[PDB]
Structure 1
Amino acid sequence: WGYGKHNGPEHWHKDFPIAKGERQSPVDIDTHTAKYDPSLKPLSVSYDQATSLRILNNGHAFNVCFDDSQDKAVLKGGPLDGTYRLIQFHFHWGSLDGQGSEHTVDKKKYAAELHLVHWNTKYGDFGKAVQQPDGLAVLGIFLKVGSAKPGLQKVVDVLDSIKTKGKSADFTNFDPRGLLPESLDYWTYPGSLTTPPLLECVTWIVLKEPISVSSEQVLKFRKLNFNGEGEPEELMVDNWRPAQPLKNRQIKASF
């Protein structure tokens, strides 16, 4: 599977039939239809002891993986019951500034989307958690192009070390608090992983406020390669799944 004409999102259902399920992600967020829920709690983002390990080019995007063997970087509150541990973040992005996000807002696409992936500690490990309807919480943050994001620059700086598929580099002491916008106002809905295996395990928490990154920062994302070293060069762009049908779901708003 991938993002091309012959293996992209329209093909995924042939290997991952859940691709046509009842709670697939991403979705369009229709701002006028989202339901304000005053009983929704503020988000609690506790990233003060985060332990980043490494950065990997996985062939589809790049991951930054964290030590999730203790409560070091956790998401609580909002729509969540219990404690979700940060395992990784990654991005989805476009070939052009007018596309690249997975979620849309009134059908508007952003240049990119950051996913901070967390799992519910009551299930013991990430592999157990992805098999549960409340196993994961993914915090989604839109990227627009404008001013640089200083907290992203260390990520941009190391991408030359992981240009091709399967390359990894040490990436310790990275502070993911540098990727957050000012407001933690959010939308929330039940959905899925947006790549195979497309499991329906995710509570999506999508922040209202985008972050802005510079032209130079997003251009460095687009110089990554899908291919392995010595295979035909294919730029790593447009690694996003389009909006899926909302079906029997209500998007709730904290605001």
Structure 2
Amino acid sequence: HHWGYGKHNGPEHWHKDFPIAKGERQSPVDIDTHTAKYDPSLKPLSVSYDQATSLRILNNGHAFNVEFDDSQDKAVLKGGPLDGTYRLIQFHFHWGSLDGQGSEHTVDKKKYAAELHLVHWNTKYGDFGKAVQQPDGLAVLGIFLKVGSAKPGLQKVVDVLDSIKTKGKSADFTNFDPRGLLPESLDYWTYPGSLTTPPLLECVTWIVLKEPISVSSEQVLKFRKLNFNGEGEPEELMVDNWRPAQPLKNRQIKASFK
């Protein structure tokens, strides 16, 4: 009886195994655009992905993860609210059963069809396992997906999903360039928060881009053909793998922009 996104094991249940679920800096949150303050001291974000080395794509029973070689400073996130250098380790998405839901963060209570998380760890903690124990261990770059025009840079992801339909399946996934998933603008909101799944550790600087990317109906439909279950188990479609908005509590969301 492991955590998941069903009626009996979903987000309202997680606090029983992970009491930090009701903590002081939980993610995601609603971004009230009128209450977020412009912080003219925030530096522009630095996204250096030109040497990014993708290795593998994995269905972990909760989402699919595209994993990167993070054994050197290849793909890094710096500037914005961050002190130091954060190394890209993996990306994944959260998505809905319908185009009207799927994102974890909301903007004035608006839900997007999906949300991309580019996950980075602080290189002063040496490994991701150490970083998740620190209040400034991770920086997650969050990008909203809306349904409209196709995102050409996503199609290589969409087309390998047949090969990792069920929990525990992995496939080689080399030479994938995550710059193809970025919107034009790097305008962002930032706040201190948490992992959005168990173990819900309060180790994340969230950096949420204002500008969504557009993906096609056919592209998101392929996300929705994935399975939460293992091979040879009854089919349960991988949909609505998103946690809802958590209380902001004693936090301010800052904007990089007016």
Once the two structures are TM-superposed, the CA of residue 67 in structure 1 deviates from its matched residue by: 0.4
Alpha-carbon distance in structure 2 between the residues aligned to 1:122 and 1:135 = 9
Once the two structures are TM-superposed, the CA of residue 15 in structure 1 deviates from its matched residue by: 0.2
**Residue 132 (structure 2) aligns with:** 130
Aligned partner of 1:20 among 15, 19, 22: 22
Alpha-carbon distance in structure 2 between the residues aligned to 1:5 and 1:29 = 26
**Residue 49 (structure 1) aligns with:** 51
Once the two structures are TM-superposed, the CA of residue 22 in structure 1 deviates from its matched residue by: 0.1
Alpha-carbon distance in structure 1 between the residues aligned to 2:206 and 2:62 = 21
Alpha-carbon distance in structure 2 between the residues aligned to 1:88 and 1:109 = 23
Deviation string 1:157-213 (CA, Å, 9 cap, x unpaired) is: 100000000000000000000000000000000000000000000000000000000
Once the two structures are TM-superposed, the CA of residue 142 in structure 1 deviates from its matched residue by: 0.1
Once the two structures are TM-superposed, the CA of residue 59 in structure 1 deviates from its matched residue by: 0.2
Once the two structures are TM-superposed, the CA of residue 72 in structure 1 deviates from its matched residue by: 0.4
Identity among equivalent positions (%) equals: 100
Once the two structures are TM-superposed, the CA of residue 75 in structure 1 deviates from its matched residue by: 0.1
How many positions carry a matched residue from both structures?
255
Once the two structures are TM-superposed, the CA of residue 249 in structure 1 deviates from its matched residue by: 0.1
Using the size of structure 2 for normalisation, the TM-score is 0.99
Once the two structures are TM-superposed, the CA of residue 254 in structure 1 deviates from its matched residue by: 0.3
Once the two structures are TM-superposed, the CA of residue 77 in structure 1 deviates from its matched residue by: 0.1
Alpha-carbon distance in structure 1 between the residues aligned to 2:149 and 2:117 = 20
Q: CA RMSD in A?
A: 0.2
Once the two structures are TM-superposed, the CA of residue 60 in structure 1 deviates from its matched residue by: 0.6
Once the two structures are TM-superposed, the CA of residue 86 in structure 1 deviates from its matched residue by: 0.2
Once the two structures are TM-superposed, the CA of residue 96 in structure 1 deviates from its matched residue by: 0.2
Using the size of structure 1 for normalisation, the TM-score is 1.00
Deviation string 1:143-169 (CA, Å, 9 cap, x unpaired) is: 000000000000001000000000000
**Residue 192 (structure 1) aligns with:** 194
Once the two structures are TM-superposed, the CA of residue 49 in structure 1 deviates from its matched residue by: 0.4
DSSP-derived class of the 2:208 partner: strand
DSSP-derived class of the 2:124 partner: helix
Once the two structures are TM-superposed, the CA of residue 30 in structure 1 deviates from its matched residue by: 0.2
Once the two structures are TM-superposed, the CA of residue 9 in structure 1 deviates from its matched residue by: 0.2
DSSP-derived class of the 2:57 partner: strand
Once the two structures are TM-superposed, the CA of residue 135 in structure 1 deviates from its matched residue by: 0.3
Alpha-carbon distance in structure 1 between the residues aligned to 2:77 and 2:164 = 28
Find out whether 1:229 has 2:231 as its counterpart: yes
Alpha-carbon distance in structure 2 between the residues aligned to 1:164 and 1:135 = 30
Equivalence map 1:1-255=2 (5 Å): 1-255=3-257
Alpha-carbon distance in structure 2 between the residues aligned to 1:222 and 1:65 = 20
Once the two structures are TM-superposed, the CA of residue 40 in structure 1 deviates from its matched residue by: 0.3
Once the two structures are TM-superposed, the CA of residue 123 in structure 1 deviates from its matched residue by: 0.2
Alpha-carbon distance in structure 2 between the residues aligned to 1:240 and 1:46 = 28
DSSP-derived class of the 2:160 partner: helix
Deviation string 1:128-151 (CA, Å, 9 cap, x unpaired) is: 000000000000000000000000
Alpha-carbon distance in structure 1 between the residues aligned to 2:50 and 2:214 = 23
Deviation string 1:12-64 (CA, Å, 9 cap, x unpaired) is: 00000000000000000000000100000100000010000100000010000
Once the two structures are TM-superposed, the CA of residue 233 in structure 1 deviates from its matched residue by: 0.2
Once the two structures are TM-superposed, the CA of residue 102 in structure 1 deviates from its matched residue by: 0.0
Alpha-carbon distance in structure 2 between the residues aligned to 1:85 and 1:39 = 23
Alpha-carbon distance in structure 2 between the residues aligned to 1:138 and 1:227 = 27
Alpha-carbon distance in structure 2 between the residues aligned to 1:34 and 1:105 = 11
Where does structure 1 differ by over 2 angstroms across 4 or more consecutive aligned residues? none
Once the two structures are TM-superposed, the CA of residue 227 in structure 1 deviates from its matched residue by: 0.4
Alpha-carbon distance in structure 1 between the residues aligned to 2:32 and 2:201 = 24
Alpha-carbon distance in structure 2 between the residues aligned to 1:50 and 1:173 = 8
